[PDB]
Structure 1
């Protein structure tokens, strides 16, 4: 079990402008990574997913690159 990075006090604030922050959590195929592989908590994973979907909508991330 590895620690959820956002739950740490140093944890960066989650938002969909940050491109590299989400890049760390989307695979090379353009898909969202899983909780078991990433390690973040349920709430932070949900925030990640919504942010990635929004960034995909505003064309800052590709659909299935």
Structure 2
């Protein structure tokens, strides 16, 4: 199950789209790899940067702890 499938059409630069973007972070806050993300090379760079912005605006975590 990859995230590009589990989501319809989205904008890879709306750094304010928490509902879209948070789907791209593991349970432990890390930016998922393409093997999870499903984005291409070029798409993955765009997503991460806009993820990184949303972390600075407090919209996304930099890290969450791990629950069992």
**1:2-13 aligned within 5 A:** 5=4, 11-13=9-11
**1:1-65 aligned within 5 A:** 5=4, 11-14=9-12, 15-65=14-64
Report the TM-score when normalising by structure 1. Answer: 0.77
Aligned length: 59
Report the TM-score when normalising by structure 2. Answer: 0.74
CA displacement 1:5-40 (0-9 Å, x = unmatched): 4xxxx7322211000111111111010000112211
Unaligned 5+ segments in structure 2 are: none
Unaligned 5+ segments in structure 1 are: none
